[PDB]
Every structure is written in C-alpha cells, then in structure tokens.
Amino acid sequence: KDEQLQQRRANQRLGAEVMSQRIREMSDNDPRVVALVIRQWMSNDHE
Amino acid sequence: KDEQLQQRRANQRLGAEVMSQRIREMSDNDPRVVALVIRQWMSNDHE
Amino acid sequence: NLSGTDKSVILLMTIGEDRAAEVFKHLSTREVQALSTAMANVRQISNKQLTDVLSEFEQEAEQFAALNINANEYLRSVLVKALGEERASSLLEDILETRDTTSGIETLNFMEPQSAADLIRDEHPQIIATILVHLKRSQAADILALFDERLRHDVMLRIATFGGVQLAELTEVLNGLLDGQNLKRSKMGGVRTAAEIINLMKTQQEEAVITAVREFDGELAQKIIDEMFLFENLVDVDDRSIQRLLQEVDSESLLIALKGAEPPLREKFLRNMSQRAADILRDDLANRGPVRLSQVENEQKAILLIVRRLAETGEMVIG
Amino acid sequence: NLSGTDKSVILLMTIGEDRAAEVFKHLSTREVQALSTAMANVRQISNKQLTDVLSEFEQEAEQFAALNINANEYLRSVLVKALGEERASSLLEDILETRDTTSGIETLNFMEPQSAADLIRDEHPQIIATILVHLKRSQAADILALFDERLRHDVMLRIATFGGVQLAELTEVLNGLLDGQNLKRSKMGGVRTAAEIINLMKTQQEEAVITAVREFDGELAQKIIDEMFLFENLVDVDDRSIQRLLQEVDSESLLIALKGAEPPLREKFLRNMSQRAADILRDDLANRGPVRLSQVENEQKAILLIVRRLAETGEMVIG
Amino acid sequence: RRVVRERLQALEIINERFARQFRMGLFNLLRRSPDITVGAIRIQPYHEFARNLPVPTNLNLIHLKPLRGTGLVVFSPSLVFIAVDNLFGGDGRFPTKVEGREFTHTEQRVINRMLKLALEGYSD
C-alpha cells in the first residue's frame, strides 16, 4: 500500500518533470504563447 | 487526450509555418498581389 | 469572432519583418503605431484564428492575381528608356497631387464642418473661396455657414473673382493645412465634457458652479445650461419624445421623479398617457407621501441616463 | 480547490528562474513581491494540484497559439531596416503613453473619488479641469463633488477655458501623480477605525473618551458620534431595517436589550411587529424584572454586531 | 560699515541677449511668443534684496565653476502659475493666488523645466 503510493508518487514526479521540460521547450521556442497566458494568470489572480 | 492535442498543435504549427513560407515565396515573386490585399486589409480594418 | 484589424495584424506579423517595414513605409504612421502596439501587447492569432486569417488572405491572393510588380521605380525605368525620365517626373507629381488634393477634399468633406471652418477661419478669404469651390456643395456650404457675416459675404464675393484656377500651389496649400491637424488633437475642447461632469457632480455643487460661472461669464453659463437642457420643458424635447420616455422607463421610477418635478413637468408627462394611465399616475402621486430627496435625485439621474442613451441611439433629437 | 493566484504561483515556479525573472520585469513589483512571499512560505502545488495547474496552463497554451514572438526589440529591428529607427520611437512612446494615460484614467475612475479629489486638491485647477474632462463623466463629477465651492466653480469655469488640449505633458502629469500613491499607503486615516475601537471599549470608558474629545473638538466628536449612529433613532435606520433586525435576532435577546432601551426605541421596535407579536413583547418586558446591566450590554453588543454584519452584506443602508 | 560703487557696461548687453534667447526658448516651449522686459540692474545689500523679495517665491542655487560660490535665481508664483496653465493651455482669466503653501510635486517639476531651460539659455 504505502510502497505502491510511494512508487506512484515517484513516477508522477518523473512524468511531471518531463512534461514541465515540454513547457520549457515550447516557451523557449515561442514567447507569444507565454505573455498571453501570463495575462490570463493575472486575470485569474485578480478575479 | 492532452498528448494527442499537443501533437495536433505541433503538426498544425509545422503546416502553418510551411504554408507561411508559401506566402513568403509568392509575395517575393509577385508584389502586386501584396499591395491590393494590404488595401483590402485596411478596408476591413476601417470597416 | 476575430475583428478585421486583428486578422490584418496577424497577417502583418506573418508576412515577415522586411515586408512589414515596407508596408509601414507604404502606409500611415498611425497604422504603423497601431501594428506595433498590437504585436507588443497580445498576438492576435490562435491556431483556428491563424488558419482563418491565412485562409482569407489566400482567397484574397487567389482573387488578387495579375502577374504584376509595384514598380515604384521599375515601371518608371522602362518608361524612361523609351521616352526619357523628364517626360514623366512633373506629370506624375501633378497626377499624384491631384490624387492627394482630391484625397484632402474628401477628408475635409468627411471631417466636421465647424472644425474645418475654424481651421480655415484664420486663412485667406481667397483660400476659403477656392476650397469651397473645390469641395462638395454640401461641404462647401457647411464650412461657409460657420463663418461670420462679413467673412462669409467676402467669401461668396471672391468665389466669382476666383478666375485664376491655380495649379501646383493649390496642392501645396492642401499640404500646409494637412500638417496642422496632427498637432491639433483637441476633440474635447468644446464646453460639452465639462457640462457632462457638471451633470455628474452633486446637485448643490453644480448649482454653486453654475453661480460661479454666471459670475465669470453669463454667456458661457447660458451656453452650458443650454447644453444641460434635458426634459426641463415641453418645447425643447417634444411631446413624442415625452411619450417615448414614459413607455421606456418604469412607472414607479417616473412617479418618484415626478414627486419633486414641477407641475408643468407633471402636465407634460401626463398629456401623452391615455386617460386611464394619467389617472393612475395622478392618483399614485397624490397617495404617495414625502420621500427623502436623495432617492428621488438618484432615480432622476437614472432616468436622464436613459434619455442620454436614447439620444445616443439617435431615435429623436433633444433641444 | 486551488485559488487562481496559487495556480499562477505554481506555474511561476515551474516556468524556470530566468523566465520568472523576465515575468517579474514585465509585471508589477507588487506581483513580484507576492510571488516571492508565496514561494518562500509554502509551495502552492500538490501532485493533483500540479497536475491541475499544468493541465490548465496547457489548455491556455493550446488556445494561445499564434506562432509569434514578444519582439520588444525584434519587431522594431525589422521595422527599422524598412523605414528607419526614428520613424517609430516617438510614435511608439506616444501610443504607449496613450495606453498608459488611459490606464491611469481607468485606475482613477475605479479608485475612491474623495481620495482622488484630495490627491488632486493641492494640484492646479487646470489640472483638475483637464483630468475631469478626460475621466468618465460619473468619475469627473465624483472628484468635482468633493471640492469646496470656490475651487469647484473655478474648475467648471476652466473646463471651458481648456482649449489647448495638451499632449506629452498630460501623460507626464499622470506619471507624476502615479508616483505618489505608493507612498500614500493610509487606508485607515479616516475617523472610522478609532470609532470602531470606541465602540469596542468599555461603556464608561468610551463615554469618558467622548467627553474628552468633545473638549478637544466638538466638531470631531460630533462626526465620530455620527459614525457611532446605529439604531438609536427611527429616521436614521428606517422602519424597514427595524423590521429586518427583529426577524433576524432572537426575541429574548431583543427584549433583554429593550429592557434598558429608551421608550422611543421600544416604540420603534414594536411598530414593525404585528399586533400579537407586539403584545407578546410588551407583556414579556413588563413581566421580566430587573437584570444586571452587564448581560444587557453584552446582548446589545451582539445585536449591534449582527447589525454591522447586515450592513456589511449591504442589504440596506444605515444612517 | 559696508560700501561699494561701480558702473557696468557689458552685463547689460549680456542680459539683453540672454533675454532674447529665453524669449525664443519660452516661445518654442509654450507654442506662444512671450515678451521679456529687463529691468535696470540692481546693486544692493543682501538684506535689502531679501526684504524686497516678495515672499512666498521659489529660489534656486546654480553654482558657477571655477569661481567659488553659488548663483541664485527666483521666479514669481504668478509666473509659475501662468506658465503651467499655458502648458495646459488655460486662458488664465480665472487665476488663483497661493501664499505660504509650498509648491506641489507637479509645480516643482514645472519649475524644474523652467530652471533647466533658463540654465541652458544663460549658459550659452
């Protein structure tokens, strides 16, 4: 049980970090998709 | 789901950039088809 | 939906930096600034939007097919070898100025007549007469109407005297007056924005302001009050518009507003209604007791906001 | 549930340090400080939360697709080769200031009218008039209402005199007033927080404080008492709100509070109730004997806390 | 006991040409041609000048290297009011008078533009 949950957390972290690298590469290759989503972020923050 | 959407976005970007290169080459080889469409653009902008 | 400007903006990013700079040179600096601001803020194209703008540009390119070059020099070079460069420069400049002076004529026709008149009020009466002749007869009259009697009479007198029909200098005259608009800005100078703020201010505060400006200038105060005029009397707003208000505003709010209104105001707001509606309104006004004036003023302000919205829609005129 | 700020905060950690610094440069220093505090305290993302914030960011990226760069320099460089760098700097700065001055106009419209008026009270009457003209007519009136009669009258008089419609200096004027807000802080200066503390204090203690401040300044004491005013008389709070209290507070607590209340207070708190309820309350008040004033004061304080909560909800106004 | 006498020639012409330069500078700054009337050069003790100075008014220190000491310039509240309202395009037919009240931040900034323009004019 606990060991299975720990392994699930580990593989979830691995998937999260590789997919975060996907964010990193797409943001590096296209800044426009970054500024507008930042604007959406601040819209959500103030809303 | 999300991975399929990401791959769709990637291939759409590739198609968009090659077809934009098609615009680039046709505009380079014929400026007349550019000025009139710019006039149409400003017509749409002010209309 | 994507606006026509945004599609054009996305196309301007897509066509490349050198082509964008060339288009900036070929177009107006205000357009250049608008495109720069647009590409700085948020990109205008999404994957569906980019598809749409690119597809509609393609359909524009399919339709704009002619196998030709802009030749802002290549066409002249082919002409120059056959006839010589000189057999063109002057004539081409004259043709462009004729296009330019007609463009200015149309622009002056479109832009506001009194603004044109005051821009040309300082100018020569011969200038006024020739520009009036060149303009549309509706536009020429509109500039003429906004003049004083003496200047206007001199303008019509000089209309006949204008027999020189001069030609390069006229275009340069249009160029000179054109360069003064971008510095003029304005568009708020008229005693209307201050009038709206006076309406917005607290009742006693704008009453004191009205007294102060009456002390400052009775004529200016009277002009601003004429700008104030909104359903304070029957003749200015007309019985049809009085009917329009009552059929567009809540009856309870109208009655509460009429509580503090003048008896001529009640009479003008009751004549339009039928006998039954007028009797109901009069009975409600008689039965309802005194109410704190704050709510009455707030409802009156809301009603006048509705009136201003109707005037902006332009169904009928007020004044 | 994860708040929109926390999702944005987690995304700010995830996007990398250099990108976070660039976003800090592109955004406000208050946002930079908020993000720094958030990443210092507790991380905002759990494994489900990180999945949610990353997924929603992905859906934002799918929708925000345009194949474009921010180009806070690259776009200018493409424009500069085609037309020249100068054919832009001035126009781009003017456009940005127009966006900046409109941003300041909207900010002033949103922020409190009297605060804007006192921030501009020291400033030039021409400044007041032009800012009033530029502002919304509701906002312009709100700043105008909070002025003295003489300054207000001068402002409306100068509204007409404002014909220069000046343009870079106006933006710099907005910049100058903008830089004074971050130092102003305040937001408690008004004699309201002290009023709440006076209410919180022990009955005899705030009575002595009221006497002392009456000695210090009768006008200030009267203003603070007007701030005190909470269901001490019928006209200030209105019969509808009196009805609202009785249907929202326990009858026993209301009666115990009415034990030490004035007979006008009992009359105003009995008129709203029906005949049966009023008779029951009067009989209970007559039958119940004397009680130590500590419990009566505590229940009155609880009732007034309920009244303050109702006022905060904003169903009806009090005063 | 403090006595000084002298007669001056050159600084009169210097003031006249600086006044013309300042007039054209203000003309281009405020899109309206001003007129400057240079008064007769005044020689007086510092206390007399201070007494004659209309309080309130803004005084500014401008050093003159390599000569030891700092120069002084002053501007009237009427002048700053008129200049700032002309900057706003105000007619000025409803003027206000402020006494004892220190200049606001914006007013001090406008004073800063007059100061820099005058400094450049006198420098040239």
Residue numbers in the entry:
A (entry chain FA), B (entry chain LA): 514 to 560
C (entry chain MA), D (entry chain GA): 3 to 168, 172 to 324
E (entry chain HA): 44 to 167
Give sentences copied directly from the paper behind this entry.
Rotation is driven by a flagellar motor, which is a supercomplex containing multiple rings.
To build the model, we docked modules from the assembled CCW pose as rigid bodies into the CW maps. Here FliFC–FliGD1 and FliGD2 of the inner ring and FliGD5 of the outer ring each rotate by ~180°. As a part of this, FliGD2 changes the subunit that it binds, altering the domain swaps. In the CW pose, FliGD5 rotates and presents the MotA/B binding site to the inside of the ring, with torque likely transmitted along the same path, albeit in the opposite direction. The CCW and CW poses of the switch also help explain cooperativity, which induces the subunits of the C-ring to preferentially adopt the same pose.
